[PDB]
């Protein structure tokens, strides 16, 4: 398990500047991000076996996303990933892609969790970072709206449960993983 807490917090402070998040909710968000990333990368490696030179680029990820993200979530994640790869191929790699999530850390988590001799390109890390950042963002807004609905300035695991149940595709994703 890696930790994304700082990136999760930065995304939160974009979409809900006034709103905080508890340790229990942060733990859950870290589980969410890691458990999704491990599915996406498990598909990228197996897809890269069918690639003579074990190469991984934004296509293996754009296909792992469709395999996993239900319906509308996939459409929006793929759109965000392409817009980010565009911003990157044109400061840090993540700022270059216009992202809060870590591009380089994820590039490295992509070599270690996938191919070895082949070549994982930087566009693949950019794409993966945008996918994770988008998913994190949706969950955080939904729960933050919910916590504001209860006149509270702090997302708890209860608000997380509410934001996940009141959206069919997020619900599916969580159960599936």
């Amino acid at each position: 398990k890696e930790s994304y807490s700082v990136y999760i917090y930065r995304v939160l402070k974009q979409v809900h500047p006034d709103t905080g998040v508890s340790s229990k909710a942060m733990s859950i968000m870290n589980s969410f991000v890691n458990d999704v990333f491990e599915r996406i990368a498990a598909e990228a490696s197996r897809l890269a076996h069918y690639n003579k030179r074990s190469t991984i680029s934004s296509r293996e990820i754009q296909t792992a996303v469709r395999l996993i993200l239900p319906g509308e979530l996939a459409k929006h994640a793929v759109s965000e990933g392409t817009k980010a790869v565009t911003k990157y191929t044109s400061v840090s790699r993540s700022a270059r892609a216009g992202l809060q999530f870590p591009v380089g850390r994820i590039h490295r988590f992509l070599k270690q969790r996938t191919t070895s001799s082949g070549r994982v390109g930087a566009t693949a890390a950019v794409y993966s970072a945008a996918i994770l950042e988008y998913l994190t963002a949706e969950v955080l807004e939904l729960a933050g709206n919910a916590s504001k609905d209860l006149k509270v300035k702090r997302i708890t695991p209860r608000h997380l449960h509410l934001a996940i149940r009141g959206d069919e595709e997020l619900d599916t994703l969580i159960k599936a993983t």
């Binding site: 930790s3 700082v6 870590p102 380089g104 850390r105 270690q112």
Partner: protein, 273 residues
């Protein structure tokens, strides 16, 4: 450092000869500057050696706290476990789990510190984790003749290997490299020397067989102690980039993790890159 691929080649090539020769004189002068930098780096090496004695007390006391040989004082207990906590937060933290006398010391200190550094985390595989749990201390010392330093990992009695200390030693050149004098940017590694690990039966996670049946390298942190050979005894630039990676990991452990181990245990030192 870099042939013809120098950023300003076209300007240089277009320079009158008499100016090109002044630039050549500056290259000569840059070699002299580099020799002075070499001597400066030797002085810094001696400073690190001199300061080992000054650091020694805080490091031994850390070892003792971790091994449970000494108990915290009230001054230490009043030091916040994490900085940047609202007051109720620190108190709830201190109340989130009751004391447990069956727990000696700080289990898994060095393992957690090592795996929280991103570079060293890349070298730790799942099969290394229980071995590193037996790590009771990590130490470093520097020498002047021969010039370099060592890192020593102290292991409690354990079912994986019989060694009490695993040692990594780096031999450094502080003089400008003669193969590339202007490329000098500090001490460079001449040789890495590891330690023979006396594995118990069935425990050598660094070695695997494949089918003729040949023994090959498996991925393991403990390949740190079988470092790549150098031209001295050596692809040719693969064991050379491997050697740099091994030296960079050495430097991380010596310079960063050992002096700041608890901040890696907590995770209070992070990297975005």
């Amino acid at each position: 450092q870099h042939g013809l691929l120098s950023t300003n080649f076209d300007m240089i090539q277009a320079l009158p000869l008499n100016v090109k020769q002044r630039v050549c004189a500056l290259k000569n002068l840059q070699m002299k500057t580099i020799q002075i930098e070499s001597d400066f780096y030797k002085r810094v090496h001696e400073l690190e050696i001199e300061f080992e004695g000054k650091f020694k007390s805080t490091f031994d006391q850390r070892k003792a706290i971790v091994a449970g040989e000494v108990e915290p004082t009230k001054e230490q207990i009043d030091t916040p476990i994490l900085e940047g906590l609202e007051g109720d937060q620190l108190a709830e933290l201190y109340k989130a789990a009751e004391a447990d006398p069956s727990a000696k010391g700080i289990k898994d200190f060095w393992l957690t510190a090592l795996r929280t550094h991103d570079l060293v985390a890349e070298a730790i595989e799942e099969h290394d984790v229980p071995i590193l749990s037996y790590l009771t201390d990590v130490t470093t010392a520097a020498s002047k003749d021969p010039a370099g330093f060592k890192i020593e990992f102290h292991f409690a009695t354990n079912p994986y290997f019989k060694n009490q200390v695993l040692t990594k030693t780096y031999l450094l050149g502080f003089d400008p490299d003669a193969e590339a004098p202007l490329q000098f940017d500090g001490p460079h590694v001449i040789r890495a020397v590891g330690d023979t690990i006396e594995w118990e039966d069935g425990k050598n996670v660094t070695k695997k067989a494949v089918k003729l049946t040949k023994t090959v390298k498996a991925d393991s942190f403990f390949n740190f102690f079988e470092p790549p050979k150098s031209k001295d005894e050596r692809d040719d630039e693969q064991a050379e980039e491997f050697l740099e990676l091994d030296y960079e990991m050495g430097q991380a452990i010596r310079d960063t993790i050992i002096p700041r181990a608890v901040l890696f245990y907590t995770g209070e030192l992070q990297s975005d890159d």
